[PDB]
Design a protein around this ligand. Sequence first.
Ligand SMILES: [Cl-]
Ligand SMILES: [Cl-]
Ligand SMILES: [Cl-]
Length: 220
Amino acid sequence: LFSNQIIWFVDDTNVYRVTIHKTFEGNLTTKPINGAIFIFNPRTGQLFLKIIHTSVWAGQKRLGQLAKWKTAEEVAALIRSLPVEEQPKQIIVTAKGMLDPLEVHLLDFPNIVIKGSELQLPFQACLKVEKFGDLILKATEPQMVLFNLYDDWLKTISSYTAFSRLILILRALHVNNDRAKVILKPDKTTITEPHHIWPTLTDEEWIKVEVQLKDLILAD
Ligand SMILES: [Cl-]
Ligand SMILES: [Cl-]
Ligand SMILES: [Cl-]
């Protein structure tokens, strides 16, 4: 996972999003809201966030199915925009419905291996992190935004350790957002830098946090 080969995880979970409301007449209305594709490099921490504006669905039906195809289209478009040296060698998807769309969209890229995964990597949780949630909510058109999901961690820990830390954060936020946010703020003075995603914590603080997040996930 952290070798010389560029690897991307691709998450389509958040592409097609809706709000459901029961009207005064007793029927359900379903209205799309903006979504996002998450494309993540586990070695470097790079995230490509492709915001999906609701206008893309105009006209269309079976939007949850079409979202798999839209995701594959956008992955291919990103790849086309990158020099060959920056293109991934492997694309890993935790949703099985992404496999066939990606295969058909990436026929011009014979070097790229597509595989499925049973890992729990819930980028959905990022919608709970104000930076991402508000950006996605308020967008008025599609756009791509770059992030570094490991902040400054790699100065002192390995990619393996950083990946493990990130997964514990995402899973804990997914399972119990309120308690995870408390765990991640151990002191009144804990802050997150404006250009960071996650709090600035000491090594001792991260040790305790990681154990607490793991325990939270186990308690579900
Ligand atoms: Cl884009
Ligand atoms: Cl490593
Ligand atoms: Cl989870």
